[PDB]
Amino acid sequence: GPDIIPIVAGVVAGIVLIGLALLLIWKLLMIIHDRR
DSSP, rough: OOOOOOHHHHHHHHHHHHHHHHHHHHHHHHHHHHOO
């Protein structure tokens, strides 16, 4: 869209960081119940 690119660069970027940050901490959750 018009005058929306600047917004996407910020949001679309953070979206990739959230999906990666969750998968990281995710391993910290399973690593505990892995030995349980």
